[PDB]
Design a protein around this ligand. Sequence first.
Ligand SMILES: Nc1nc2c(ncn2[C@@H]2O[C@H](COP(=O)(O)OP(=O)(O)O)[C@@H](O)[C@H]2O)c(=O)[nH]1
Ligand SMILES: Nc1nc2c(ncn2[C@@H]2O[C@H](COP(=O)(O)OP(=O)(O)O)[C@@H](O)[C@H]2O)c(=O)[nH]1
Ligand SMILES: Nc1nc2c(ncn2[C@@H]2O[C@H](COP(=O)(O)OP(=O)(O)O)[C@@H](O)[C@H]2O)c(=O)[nH]1
Ligand SMILES: Nc1nc2c(ncn2[C@@H]2O[C@H](COP(=O)(O)OP(=O)(O)O)[C@@H](O)[C@H]2O)c(=O)[nH]1
Lengths: 433, 433, 238, 410, 410
Amino acid sequence: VNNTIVVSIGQAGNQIAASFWKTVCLEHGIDPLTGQTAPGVAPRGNWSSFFSKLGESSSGSYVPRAIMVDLEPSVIDNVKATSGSLFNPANLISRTEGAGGNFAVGYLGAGREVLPEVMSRLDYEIDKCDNVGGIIVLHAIGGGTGSGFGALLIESLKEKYGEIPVLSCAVLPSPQVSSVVTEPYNTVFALNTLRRSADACLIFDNEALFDLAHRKWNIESPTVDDLNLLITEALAGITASMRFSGFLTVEITLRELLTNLVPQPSLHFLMCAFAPLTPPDRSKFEELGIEEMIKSLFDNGSVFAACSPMEGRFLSTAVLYRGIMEDKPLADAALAAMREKLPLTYWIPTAFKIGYVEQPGISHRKSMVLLANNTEIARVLDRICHNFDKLWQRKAFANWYLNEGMSEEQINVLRASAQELVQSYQVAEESGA
Amino acid sequence: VNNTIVVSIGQAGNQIAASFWKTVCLEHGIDPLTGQTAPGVAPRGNWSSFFSKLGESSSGSYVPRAIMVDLEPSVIDNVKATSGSLFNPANLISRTEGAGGNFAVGYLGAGREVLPEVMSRLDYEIDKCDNVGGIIVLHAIGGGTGSGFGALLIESLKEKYGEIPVLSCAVLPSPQVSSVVTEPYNTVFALNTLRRSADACLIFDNEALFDLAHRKWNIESPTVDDLNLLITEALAGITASMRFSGFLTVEITLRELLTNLVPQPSLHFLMCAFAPLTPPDRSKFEELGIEEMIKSLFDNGSVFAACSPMEGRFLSTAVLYRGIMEDKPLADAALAAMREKLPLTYWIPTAFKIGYVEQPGISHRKSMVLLANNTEIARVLDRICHNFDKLWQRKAFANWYLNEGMSEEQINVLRASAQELVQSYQVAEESGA
Amino acid sequence: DTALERQIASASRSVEEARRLAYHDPIRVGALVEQISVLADLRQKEGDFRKAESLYREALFRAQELRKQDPDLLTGIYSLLAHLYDRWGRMDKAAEFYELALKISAENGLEESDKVATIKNNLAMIFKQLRKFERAEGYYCEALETFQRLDGEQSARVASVYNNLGVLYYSHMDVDRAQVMHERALAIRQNLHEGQMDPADLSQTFINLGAVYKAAGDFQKAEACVDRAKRIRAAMNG
Amino acid sequence: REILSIHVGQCGNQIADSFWRLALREHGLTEAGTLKSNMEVFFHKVRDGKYVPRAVLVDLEPGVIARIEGGDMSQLFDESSIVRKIPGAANNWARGYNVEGEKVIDQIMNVIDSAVEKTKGLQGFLMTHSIGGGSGSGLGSLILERLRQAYPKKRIFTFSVVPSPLISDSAVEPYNAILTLQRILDNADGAVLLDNEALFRIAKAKLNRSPNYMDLNNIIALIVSSVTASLRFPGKLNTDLSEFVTNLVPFPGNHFLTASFAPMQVRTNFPDLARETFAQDNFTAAIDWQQGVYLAASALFRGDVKAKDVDENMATIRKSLNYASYMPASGGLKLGYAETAPEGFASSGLALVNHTGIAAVFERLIAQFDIMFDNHAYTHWYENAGVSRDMMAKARNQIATLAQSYRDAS
Amino acid sequence: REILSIHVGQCGNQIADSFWRLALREHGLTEAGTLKSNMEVFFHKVRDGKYVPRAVLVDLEPGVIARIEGGDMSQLFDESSIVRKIPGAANNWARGYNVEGEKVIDQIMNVIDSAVEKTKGLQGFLMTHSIGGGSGSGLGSLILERLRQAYPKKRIFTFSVVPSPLISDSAVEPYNAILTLQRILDNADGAVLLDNEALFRIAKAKLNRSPNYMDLNNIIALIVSSVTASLRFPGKLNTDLSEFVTNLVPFPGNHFLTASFAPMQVRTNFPDLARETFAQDNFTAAIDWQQGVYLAASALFRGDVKAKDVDENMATIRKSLNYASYMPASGGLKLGYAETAPEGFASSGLALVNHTGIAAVFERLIAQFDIMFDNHAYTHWYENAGVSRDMMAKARNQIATLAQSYRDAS
Ligand SMILES: Nc1nc2c(ncn2[C@@H]2O[C@H](COP(=O)(O)OP(=O)(O)O)[C@@H](O)[C@H]2O)c(=O)[nH]1
Ligand SMILES: Nc1nc2c(ncn2[C@@H]2O[C@H](COP(=O)(O)OP(=O)(O)O)[C@@H](O)[C@H]2O)c(=O)[nH]1
Ligand SMILES: Nc1nc2c(ncn2[C@@H]2O[C@H](COP(=O)(O)OP(=O)(O)O)[C@@H](O)[C@H]2O)c(=O)[nH]1
Ligand SMILES: Nc1nc2c(ncn2[C@@H]2O[C@H](COP(=O)(O)OP(=O)(O)O)[C@@H](O)[C@H]2O)c(=O)[nH]1
C-alpha cells in the first residue's frame, strides 16, 4: 500500500506527533506505549501505510514511519518516556542547544548539523517502504526549529526525491498573541519553503483551535494536550483514506488529495475543519447527522484557521467523510446546498473531492473532515506579511538572523516571496470572483 | 369457485386466524411461513376459495383473502413474525393505542379511524374475488376490539354489500371467569350487530374449549395455542365444503350452509362441535368409526359452548363429515338414531344438513364437524343478559362507554335488543317443544 | 417530513444540547435562552403558544436560580415573554411583561441599556394599541433619547423610533409632529445604505410621509413620496 | 403505545432507581442503556444500541439523583430529562405546588414535551410519587394539573405511596395527601395507592432480611412494570392502559387501585398463585376488609401462565372474593397475560383491585385532617406560602365526597 | 462469441464485485468458481467444474481487489488475470495514462493476450470503468488505445460511469472525462454512459434503504449483463455485440448509449414493463428531454417475455417516444429476447438508447471544461506528468465536435 512518512519537526510538530501516533496506533488497534499489537491477532485496517513490520512473530512491535526531529532534547525525551518501544529510537533524533525562535539555527545552523543524520533516516524509511507516496511533515511555522528545520528539511527532501508529495501539516502563528517574539519573521522565512518546495502546507492556527475546544469541546482552558488532539483528529482524518482498505473506502493518496486541492503551483495552502466537534462526554442523542455536520463544517468558527472562511472564496474543497454512513444520496446533496451557500471560485466549476472511509474514528462514529483550499488563507498571511513589515522598517531584532549566515538581500527576497504568495490568492480571488 | 374472506378482528380473532391460516395453508399443501407452495406443483384442493394468485410463475406466494384488524400492534406483529411473506401486509392493519375492553373504542373510536382503511381492503379483496359468497369474521364477543370493531365492521359490510353471508365465527365469554371486567357489557353491545347485521354468529366458549382439550386432548393446561386449534379445526372443518371439489364433495357455500341453519332472521347463533377429539399421539387402534363419532358429537361436554346442548332443543343441525368414508348408509343412519335421541324442534320436521368432503383433515382421517343451531344458545346469553343487568342496576363502570359517544338511551336499547335475542329462542323453545 | 417539522427537530436537539450543557455547568444560561428563542419562534409559527411560553419560563427559572443574579438576562427573558404575548394577541399581558422587564432594569443599573430602549419602544407600541397616547409618547421619547446616546443620531434604531413616533402622531392626527418625525427618519435612512438597513424601511418612510403630506394638504409632495416608494419596491426585484 | 414516566419527589425517584433497574432487566438491557419485546414503550431509541428511558427524574432536594447519577446509573438517564433544584419543597405542599413548584414546572413540562414529541404513539404517564411529602405530593399535584391541561386525552396513571397508618413519617403529612388526592381525583385517570406499612410487611415475609426502601420499592417497581407489561410483552388478552380505566373504574371518582404482586428463578405451580395474588395480606394497602366489598378486580398474570387455569382458579377466587351487589356472579374480574415474566421470576401476577376498602385509607386521611385542620395545626406553613384554608378545606370536601363515593358504591 | 471483460479503476472493479456476483448467479455458479446456458462467454473453462471468468481486474490503489480477493471471492478470479500496483493513478489522467499507466500496460495487454489466446471465439470487450477518476479514466483511456491497436476488428464496449451533474466527487473530474471521452470516441465501438445521480435516484426508488455504491452497481451489473445476455442466453431475436454498433450507432460519432433496466422473484405483467423500461426517469443518465429526440433505441427483454406483446406494447411505446425526423414511423427501435431472466427476476428489460440528450452530458462536461481549462485550473498536474495543453485542448475539440454531432443529428 502507499506508504507515508510522518516527519515531526520542532516542539509543536512533535507534540502533535506525540498525540498523532497515540491516535493512529489506537486507530489500528496497536498499543501506543509498546508498539506491539494485541497478541496473535492482526492490526485492524491497513497498518503498512504508516507502520513497518519489526519482528516477524506477528506479536512484535510495529515501528511507525516517523522521524522526530528537534534541536531541544526535552521534547523527544518526553516522547521516549511516553512511547516506550514504539518508535525506532534511531529516528528519535535530538540535540542539546535548541534553536529558540531563530530561523537561521534550524535552517542554517544546528539544523544543518542534523541534516546528514535526518536524511540518513528518511533514506532508511523510504528504502523500507513498498512505494512511498507522501511525506507529512508536522511542524509549526512559528519557531526556530519547526519553521527553521522544517523549511530546511522539505527543501532537502523534494530536492532529493521530488516525485513525492510533501504535505507540511503545520501550525500557523496565532494572531491573538505571538508565542515567539520573532514569529512573524519565522513564518515568512518558512513561507519560502512551504510555498516553493512543499506540495501543500496544511495550516492550523492556535487561536481557532482554542475556540474549537472551548466553545465546541466545552472545556474552560484548552491545553496543548487538546490543541494537539483537534489537529490530530483532523490529521488522523485526512489519513484515514490512506490507511484503510474497507468496504467502499475512497482510497485517497496524498497525490490523489493534492491533485484535487492544488489548482496551480502557488495555491497550496490548505485549511482544515472537523465535524462533529461534539465533546467526548457521550452526547449520544445529540450526535449529528450528515445533513447537519456539513452545516457545522462550514461555520466561520469551525475551521482550524484564524481567517473567516465563508467571508472569502473556497477555491478547492475536499470533504473527507469517515465512518459509518447509512445515507449516500443524503451525502453529497447537503454539499449541493453547500455548492450554493459557500463562496466558490468559478475559475473552477466544481470542486468537492469526497472521501468515504467506512472505518470509523476513535472519538467519533460519523466523523467528517474538511480540506478547503481557501483564498482567505492569504488573509492569515496578510497579517504575517504586515507584522513582518513593522519588524523590518525598524530592521528588528538584531544581527540574530544576520550573524548566522543570512543576508539583508535574502530576507527581502523571502518577504517578496511571501508577497508573491499573498498576491497569488489575491490573483485568485478577484479572478475567481 | 365461491371465494370467501376471513376477516380477523381483535386479539382473539387474530390468534385463531394466526392458527387458522396455519391450518388452511397446510391443508392445501402450502408453506404457512412463506405463502409459496411446493415448487412447480399445484396446491391440493381448490385453493382459490380462500387464496389469491400472487405472481403467475406457479411457484410464487398465494396471498390469503384475509384482513387482520386490531387496534393493538403486538398481535399482528406476532403474526408478521410468524407468517413471513404469506399475508398481504397491506391487509395486516394495526394501530397503537388499542381498545381495552371498551366497546366504544372499537365501534366508535379508534375502530372508526381504521374503518376507511379496513373497508378499502375488503374492497380490494372482493374486487379480486371471482364471486365472493361469504365473509367469515373471526373475533371475540368479549373485548373492545373484536367485539367493538367486529360489531362495527359487520354493520359496515352488510350495509355496503348485503348480498353476502357474514358468518361471525366468534368467541363468547367464558362463564367460569371473565377475561374482561366489561365483558358482559361488550357482548350485549355486539349482540346488537351479531343478531341484526350478521347472517350467522358461530359461537365458541373458552370454558368448553378448555374441557375439550383437557379431558379429550388429554393435556394438563390447554393453552390458547390449543384453544385456537380446537376452534381452527372446526373452522377448517366448516370450510372444507367451501374449499374442496373432490369425489362426492357436497359443496356447501356459506349461504348454502345458512339457508339450512338460519330458520328465521333472529335465530342464527350457531354452536359447533368436532369429532374425533382423539389426541394427536397416534391412537390408531382407538380411531373412532362413524357410528361412534356421532355418539361423541352430541355429548353435553362435546360442543364448543358453555351450555348443555342435549338439555335443550336442537333447532337446526348440520353435521359436516370430512374425510375418507367407506360407509354411506352407516352414515345418516347413526343420525337416524340421533333423530330420536336428540331434542329436536317440531316447528321443523327434520334438519340434518350433511356435508361430505373426501379431502381429509390434517390432524384426522375421518373427521366430523357439527353445527347445531341450538335453543340453549340463549342460555349462554341468558348469563350475559343477567351479568349485564347486575352491571346496569348499579350503572357500572363509569363514563367509559358514555364519554366516547354512546348514550344511556342507546345502551338500554341494546340490552333490549339482546333481550329480543334471548326471547327469540324462548319463543322458539316452547313453540318448538 | 414537512420543512417546519425538520426545523423543529433541529431546534429541539440544539435546545436539548444547551439544556444538558447547563446541567453539567449551571452558569451557561445565556446560551440556553438563545437556543430557546429559535425553538419558541417555531412553536409560535405552528400556533403552539403554550409550548413557547413553557420554554421561556424554563429559561426564566434557570436565570432566577443563578447565585450571582443577572438582571440584564432577566430583563431580556421577560421581554421575550412579552413579545410572545404580543404575537399571541394577549395585549394586556405583553404590556405587563415589558413593564416587568423595565422594573428589573430600573432597580439595578440598566436604565440606559440597549435592551431597555428596545423594550420602551415595543411597550410604547402596545400602549398605542391600548389607545393610551400619552403613555405611548412618553416611552417612545425615552427609547429615542437612549438610542441617541447609545448609537449616533445617524443610526437605524434612532430612525425606527422616529418612524414609530411619526405613526403615533399621525394616528392621533397631530400632523405637524408626524411630519417632523418622519422627515428626521427620512434624513437618517437616506445616509445608511448597506446591510445595516434594508431598503424596504426606506419605502415605509416615503409611504408614511405620503399619508402625512396628504393630511397636511400638500398633495404634490404626497404623490412624490408615494412615487419614490413605488420606485424602491420595484427596484428590489432587480 | 409508548408510556412516558415521571418520577417526582424523593419517594418517586427512589422508585425510579428500582423501576429503571427492573425495566432494564425485563427488557434485557445493561445499566448503561445499551442492549445486553416492545422496547419502545419505556425507552427512547436514541441510537442503534443505546436506549434512553422515557423518564423525567423531576426532583427537589437534588441528592436523590446524586445517588442515581453518581454511582452506577449516570450513563443511563438523559440529563435533559431531569430537574434538580434547591430548596427542596420542604415537606410542604405549598412549597412543592406553588413556591418551588412554579420555578420548575416550566422546565418540567418542556422536558416532558421534548420527550413526547419524540413519540410516535404516546399513551400514558406512569407518574411515580408519594402523596406524603412536599415534592412528591406538592409538585406531583402540580404536574398532574399541567399534564392534564396539556394532554386531556391521555391516561395519567399515578403510582402513589400513601402515608403509613402505623405512624406519621412526616408531621404535616395528612395535609399533603388531601391536597394531592384532590388533584389526583381531578386529573389522573387511575391511581395505584401503595402503603409503606403493607410494603414493610409483605417484604418482611418476602426476604429473610429486614427491608429498606430499596427493597420495598422492588414490590412497587414490579407493580409499576406489571401494570404496563401487557402493553409491552403482549401475549394474549392484551390489556393496554386504556383498559385500566374502562374496566376498573366504575364511577367517575373511584379510581384508586390497590395492587398486589405474586409470587412473594422463582416458579409457582399456579393454583396457589391466584390464592397468593388475591390474598388479603398481599394487597399493598391497609384497606378495610370486614366492611369492604370490591368493585372491580384485575388480574395480570405474566410469564408461564396458560389461560386454561383461570377457568378453574380465578372462577374459584372470585367466589371467595366479596364484590358489590351490582357486580355479576362470575363477572367483575378482568384478566390479562404477558408472554414474558419479570427477570428473576417465571410466572408472576398482579391485581389492581378497585375496592371500598381504599376509602378507609381516605377516611383515615380525613380523620387525621379533621382534627389537624380545624386547630390550624400546621396550616400557617401553607398560608404563608400561597395556599389558604379556603383552598385546603375545598380539598377536604372532595375527599370527604370521595370517601363517601365508595360507601355509595357498596 | 466469448466476451472478455476488463475492469479498470476503483469504479470499474467495484462493478466487478457486482458483476461477477451477478454473472455467477445468472449462470448458476457458486462464488468459488465451480458449478452449483452458454457459460463460455464470460467464463474460461479451466477444469470440468471450475469456471474462471474472463476478467482482468486491472487496478491501481490495490485495496479494491483486497476487498474482492480477501473476503469471499479470492478463489474465483485468477491472479494471472489482475494487476495491483502502487501508486494509484492519483485521480489524474496523466498518472493513469502516462506515468503509472505505462508501468502496467505491458502487463495489462499480456494478461489480456493470455486470456484471448484461450479463445476460441472472441467477440467483445465489456470494459468497465468510469470517466471520472484517474485509474478508470486514465488507464481506461490507455487500454482502449492499446486494445484497439491490437484488435482493430473486435467490438470494444465501454461501460463508463459519468461524473455526476449534482456535484463533482472529484476536483479535476471534468478534465478526466474529456481526456477519456476522446479515446472512447476514437477506439470503442459503443459506450454505455451511466450516471451516479440517476443511479442514486433509481436505486432510491428501488430499495427501501439508502443506497451505496454496491447497491448502485447492481443496476449497472444487470445492464452490463443484459446487453450481453442475448449473446449467452440465446432465445429468439439473437442480438450479438455486433448488432449494438450497426443498429444503435447511426453516425460514426454517436455511440454513447443510455441504458435503463426494468423491473425497478419479481414478476411483471408486461404492458407496464415497457412503460417502465422506457420511462424517462428510469434511464440511467441525466440526459436532456425537453430538447432531445432519440436516434435509435433498443429493447432487450429477457425472461418470460413473449414476442407477441411488443406488437402492442412496443409499438405503443415508440409512438410515445421522440425520434429524429430521419427515423421511420414505427421503426427505429431494435428488439431482442433471452430465454432466461436474471436470478431474482422473472422478466427483465434493457434499453440502450442512442439519444441527443447524451450531448447534454457532453455539453456539461465541456462547459465545466471551458472555464476550468482556460484558467489552468488543475492543468499543471497534467503538464508536470506528461500531458500538455495541446494534447488537452485537442481532446476538447473532438468532444465539442461530438456535442455538436448530436445537435447535427436532430
Ligand atoms: N498545536 C500546537 N502548537 C504548539 C504546541 N507547542 C507550541 N506550539 C506553537 O508552535 C509555535 C512554535 O514553537 P516551536 O516550533 O515548537 O519552537 P522551536 O522548538 O524553538 O522551533 C509557537 O507559536 C506555539 O504557539 C503544541 O503542543 N501544539
Ligand atoms: N379462543 C381464544 N380466545 C381468546 C384468545 N385470546 C383471547 N381470547 C378471548 O377473547 C376475549 C376478548 O379479548 P380481545 O377481543 O382479544 O380484546 P381486544 O383485543 O381488547 O378487543 C377474552 O374474553 C378472551 O377470553 C385466543 O387466543 N383464543
Ligand atoms: N415506598 C417507598 N416509600 C418511601 C421511600 N422513601 C420515602 N418513602 C415514604 O414516602 C413518604 C413521602 O416522602 P417524600 O414524598 O419522599 O418527601 P418529598 O420527596 O420531600 O416530597 C414518606 O412518608 C416516606 O415514608 C421509598 O424509597 N419507597
Ligand atoms: N457506479 C459507481 N460509481 C462509483 C463507484 N465508486 C466510485 N464511483 C464514482 O466513479 C467516479 C470515478 O472514481 P474512480 O474512477 O473510481 O477513481 P479512480 O479509480 O482513482 O480512477 C467517482 O466520481 C465516483 O463518484 C461504484 O462503486 N459504482
